[PDB]
Amino acid sequence: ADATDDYPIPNRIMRTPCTAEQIMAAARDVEPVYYERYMTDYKNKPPHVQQAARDRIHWFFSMDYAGRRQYSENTATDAFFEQLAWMWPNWAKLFFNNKGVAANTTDVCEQYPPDDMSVWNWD
Ligand SMILES: [Br-]
Ligand SMILES: [Br-]
Ligand SMILES: [Br-]
Ligand SMILES: [Br-]
Ligand SMILES: [Br-]
Ligand SMILES: [Br-]
C-alpha cells in the first residue's frame, strides 16, 4: 500500500552509485546462489524479455535516489505499475528481493567494472 525504506526496493539499492553489472558481478562472488538462481530464470526467458529486463534495470540505475524512491513508491502503491511484471514478475529479483543480499552486494560492487556485460552470459 505504501513503501518502507527497504520494501519493495532495498535502501542500499536506492542509494548505490553502482551499475547493474557491478551489482551482478558482486553477486556472482558474495551471493552466488542468488546470482545463479537469477541467471537460471533469465536464460529461460525469450530474447525480447531478456532485453526488456536489461533496458529496465539500466533505466533504474540511471536515476538518482529521488527517481529510484519514486519508482519504489509507485510499485508499492500499485503492484501492476511495472509493465515488465505482466511478462516476468522476478525480472529484478537479484536487485530488489531482500535487504540482506542488497547489503552484501552494495558493500563491494564499486570495485568491479561498470560495463562488464559478460555478467549477462551464463552457461
Ligand atoms: Br524489508
Ligand atoms: Br526501459
Ligand atoms: Br532521478
Ligand atoms: Br516511476
Ligand atoms: Br517470475
Ligand atoms: Br523482486
Numbering used by the authors: 32 to 154
From the paper:
To circumvent these difficulties, we examined the close homolog MSMEG_3494 of M. smegmatis, which shares 66% similar amino acids with Rv0455c and has the same function. The three-dimensional structure of MSMEG_349433–153 was solved by X-ray crystallography and refined to 2.1 Å. To this end, the crystal was soaked with sodium bromide, and the phases were determined by multiwave anomalous dispersion (MAD) using the bromide ions as the source of anomalous scattering. The unit cell contained two molecules of MSMEG_349433–153 and 11 bromide ions with ~42% of the volume being occupied by solvent molecules. MSMEG_349433–153 adopts a novel structure consisting of a helical bundle with four single turn α-helices and five longer α-helices. A disulfide bond between C49 and C140 connects the N-terminus of helix 2 and the C-terminus of helix 8, establishing a cinch-like topology. These two cysteines are conserved across all members of the DUF5078 homology, indicating that the disulfide bond plays an important role in structure stabilization. In addition, we found that other evolutionarily conserved amino acids clustered predominantly in two distinct surface-exposed patches: the interface between the flexible N-terminus and helix 5 (patch 1), and the interfacial region of helices 2, 3, 7, and 8, (patch 2). Analysis of the electrostatic potential map of MSMEG_349433–153 revealed a highly electropositive surface for patch 2, which may form an interaction interface accommodating proteins or molecules with negatively charged domains or moieties. However, the lack of chemical shift perturbations by NMR spectroscopy indicated that the close Rv0455c homolog MSMEG_3494 does not interact with carboxymycobactin. This finding is consistent with the absence of a deep cleft in the crystal structure of MSMEG_3494 and in the identical structure of Rv0455c predicted by AlphaFold36.
